[PDB]
Amino acid sequence: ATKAVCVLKGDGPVQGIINFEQKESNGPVKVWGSIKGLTEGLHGFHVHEFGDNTAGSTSAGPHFNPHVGDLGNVTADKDGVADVSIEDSVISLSGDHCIIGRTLVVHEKADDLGKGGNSRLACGVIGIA
Amino acid sequence: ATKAVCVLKGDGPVQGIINFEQKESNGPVKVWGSIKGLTEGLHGFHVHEFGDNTAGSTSAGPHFNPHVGDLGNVTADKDGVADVSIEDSVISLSGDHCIIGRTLVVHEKADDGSRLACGVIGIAQ
């Protein structure tokens, strides 16, 4: 049973802790936790290719994609709090789609997931728990 | 798989960026960079087991050791800056001794105490 964690931090007040759990390699990964500092509403949620935070989230590179790193959206409540509880079957804590050592980021805007009719607030490197 | 980077940050003034490169699987890992904010002298330099920074360096766990994570000491000069240039053949960016996703920490006292700064080691390439 592999487990991962990510502390999200930015220049603003955005911050959170995200947990990852995968009990079977090639099984689904459960991701859960909370993020604070958000404007209420839908915020894009992505794993980026590089665990490079030398320039904050700016150095994280592209959406991870061996998108595979597309985890959808999170939703902030009126205290700007977002409870995250996701189960993703595309990402992984091992092998080919492993996300350990990569960057997690919550985006300013919602991710319309390509179905829209046509700044990165915080980030952290995904580490072993 | 072949390069890693780690931003070291703590509560105090210690901060740095550290690089890792391994172009051959299971080959020696080259580690280099600088750290500033240190008292002049010898400071312990280790990889700790968890990439868990939920409590700063406090949640980082024990020295990584399935020590494998011991990288020796860095040495701060009179301006409190330590230039690092190390070659370690025990750590790796893959396999059993993979340090990617784990925590790098520089310690208060020398390694013949309090963790001054830490960071999660991430993929740079």
Side-chain angles (χ1 to χ4, degrees):
Chain A
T2 301
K3 293 183 54 52
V5 72
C6 182
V7 178
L8 289 165
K9 268 167 198 189
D11 293 317
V14 184
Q15 63 188 68
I17 300 182
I18 301 298
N19 282 110
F20 295 83
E21 194 182 345
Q22 181 181 41
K23 255 133 167 162
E24 296 102 354
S25 72
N26 104 324
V29 185
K30 298 203 162 48
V31 12
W32 75 101
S34 67
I35 308 164
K36 11 239 168 183
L38 267 11
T39 60
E40 185 157 50
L42 288 158
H43 292 279
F45 205 40
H46 317 108
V47 183
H48 282 238
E49 176 176 358
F50 305 121
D52 192 329
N53 290 347
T54 52
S57 63
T58 308
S59 48
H63 291 220
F64 176 53
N65 204 47
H67 296 275
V68 165
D70 289 355
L71 274 46
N73 290 283
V74 285
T75 53
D77 77 8
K78 295 184 166 168
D79 287 345
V81 183
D83 180 64
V84 182
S85 174
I86 306 189
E87 190 194 88
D88 195 286
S89 49
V90 173
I91 55 169
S92 188
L93 298 198
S94 68
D96 179 22
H97 293 184
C98 186
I99 60 175
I100 286 166
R102 313 202 181 262
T103 303
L104 180 56
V105 40
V106 43
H107 197 276
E108 188 185 49
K109 315 205 139 193
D111 198 318
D112 64 6
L113 304 180
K115 301 296 282 182
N118 272 333
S119 267
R120 305 171 188 177
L121 299 185
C123 80
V125 180
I126 307 165
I128 299 164
Chain B
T2 71
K3 283 196 63 134
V5 73
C6 183
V7 182
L8 292 168
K9 210 182 144 307
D11 294 316
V14 188
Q15 65 183 151
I17 294 181
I18 296 296
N19 290 114
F20 296 86
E21 187 174 338
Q22 182 184 42
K23 13 201 45 191
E24 298 105 356
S25 285
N26 321 112
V29 179
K30 195 66 136 55
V31 13
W32 76 100
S34 66
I35 306 162
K36 53 193 180 60
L38 287 172
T39 52
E40 182 160 25
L42 287 157
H43 293 277
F45 201 40
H46 335 278
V47 190
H48 280 232
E49 174 177 358
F50 306 120
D52 193 333
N53 291 348
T54 54
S57 62
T58 304
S59 47
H63 291 217
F64 174 54
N65 200 48
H67 296 274
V68 167
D70 287 356
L71 300 168
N73 293 287
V74 293
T75 53
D77 67 18
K78 302 179 168 167
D79 284 340
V81 179
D83 299 324
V84 183
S85 174
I86 306 187
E87 188 191 87
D88 194 283
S89 294
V90 172
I91 60 168
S92 186
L93 301 199
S94 67
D96 276 351
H97 295 338
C98 187
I99 60 173
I100 281 165
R102 313 201 178 264
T103 302
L104 177 54
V105 11
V106 50
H107 273 96
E108 187 187 48
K109 289 260 155 197
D111 194 322
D112 59 7
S114 80
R115 303 172 189 177
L116 298 190
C118 81
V120 183
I121 304 166
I123 299 165
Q125 174 172 16

